[PDB]
From Swiss-Prot, chain B:
Species the sequence originates in: Homo sapiens
Disease per record: Ectodermal dysplasia and immunodeficiency 1: A form of ectoderma dysplasia, a heterogeneous group of disorders due to abnormal development of two or more ectodermal structures. EDAID1 is an X-linked recessive disorder characterized by absence of sweat glands, sparse scalp hair, rare conical teeth and immunological abnormalities resulting in severe infectious diseases. Severely affected individuals may also show lymphedema, osteopetrosis, and, rarely, hematologic abnormalities. The phenotype is highly variable, and may be fatal in childhood.
Record's protein name: NF-kappa-B essential modulator
Tissue occurrence: Heart, brain, placenta, lung, liver, skeletal muscle, kidney and pancreas.
Function: Regulatory subunit of the IKK core complex which phosphorylates inhibitors of NF-kappa-B thus leading to the dissociation of the inhibitor/NF-kappa-B complex and ultimately the degradation of the inhibitor. Its binding to scaffolding polyubiquitin plays a key role in IKK activation by multiple signaling receptor pathways. Can recognize and bind both 'Lys-63'-linked and linear polyubiquitin upon cell stimulation, with a much higher affinity for linear polyubiquitin. Could be implicated in NF-kappa-B-mediated protection from cytokine toxicity. Essential for viral activation of IRF3.
PTM: Neddylated by TRIM40, resulting in stabilization of NFKBIA and down-regulation of NF-kappa-B activity.
Amino acid sequence: QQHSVQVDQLRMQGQSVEAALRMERQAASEEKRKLAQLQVAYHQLFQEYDNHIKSSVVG
Amino acid sequence: SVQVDQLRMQGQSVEAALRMERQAASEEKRKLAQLQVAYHQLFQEYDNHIKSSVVGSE
Amino acid sequence: ATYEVLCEVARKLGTDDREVVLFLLNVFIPQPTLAQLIGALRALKEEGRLTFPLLAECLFRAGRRDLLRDLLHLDPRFLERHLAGTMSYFSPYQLTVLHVDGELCARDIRSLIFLSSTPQTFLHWVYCMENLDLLGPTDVDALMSMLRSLSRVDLQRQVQTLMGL
Amino acid sequence: ATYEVLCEVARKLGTDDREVVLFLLNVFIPQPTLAQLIGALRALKEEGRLTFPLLAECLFRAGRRDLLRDLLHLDPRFLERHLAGTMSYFSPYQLTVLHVDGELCARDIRSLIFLSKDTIGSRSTPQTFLHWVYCMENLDLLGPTDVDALMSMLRSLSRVDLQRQVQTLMGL
């Protein structure tokens, strides 16, 4: 009788989690983006420093 | 009682990946955190370098 | 490549900011335009006079701590403590000038543009006086008087503290 | 703070990496210990002769691409493309030596280690190509101005292929 309503209570809760994993994956990408940027920022800060040393010994 | 088992087993696979996911997020942050400290460090080094390369003599 | 970062900075640099920035780098240009601004910066880079750690304080002094954090990736709170332990690529003259410029209010500025073949902003003034060899890091008596014409004794006394005695 | 990094690097190196690295820094020490290694690098940072950019190629040259993306945080691939478009902090001589240093196989080294042992001036006999190089330099027998003694050790070891490469790397 109420075995059907027993399914909804399991279905609806299942998604409630599936959403959280979905949201979690999102923030996970928001951070993957932050790193990637900072990585490039680091690289670039690296090159400019490298080049600066090279230009001080030559001249 | 089988359609339910087919759920409890599926939904569990989710909460599992959600736990693994939450775990990675913690590591990645640790990673970002290092790079930020790395960045500032480079900065501090590069800076002091310039300010130190300024000196004339005879 | 990395030249794009310098653009995004200009592109987000405020109107009055462009003058503050360009002033600090000694490439001053009255009420510049993007093309003019980015043009100037780009030139300071290709020459090697505009270094990341310079553009950094440069933007810090300018007040764009937000650009520092979101574009250069530095924590302004961090850099503050850092700068408070180094020499500052900018002279105590410029720092005083920038101090004044920031403390002057509408009335004063509006009045300065009046009391003064052209200026339209305090940094524009200091710029000319600098060409007319009236104002300079050597002597700031002119800038010291300018503040007397505007009832800014509190200011003239401040400029007095940041330099002589 | 920063020296924490120079240490973690030094202590994650390699019995061999230590000689490579010290060789690259114009500061050699035969089969050094984490103690001597650090003390050396540390003395280099305390005088500004060990800039992050250097310490980086040092490790890249030492083939420790691992310590780059783990302690210095530089993408090995990036430092690769970078170092290929600039002049190295190390001389052709140095980069040549390390080249040979890595190509020699056991059968070569074991042989060199023996073939020498009675090296005049040496204070320890060498058990390493670099160790040998060191000893040779300390006698004005090697160096960039003249690597004809390096070619000899090579043709004797039957690595004329290296003799050629060394002769190509340097010229004539």
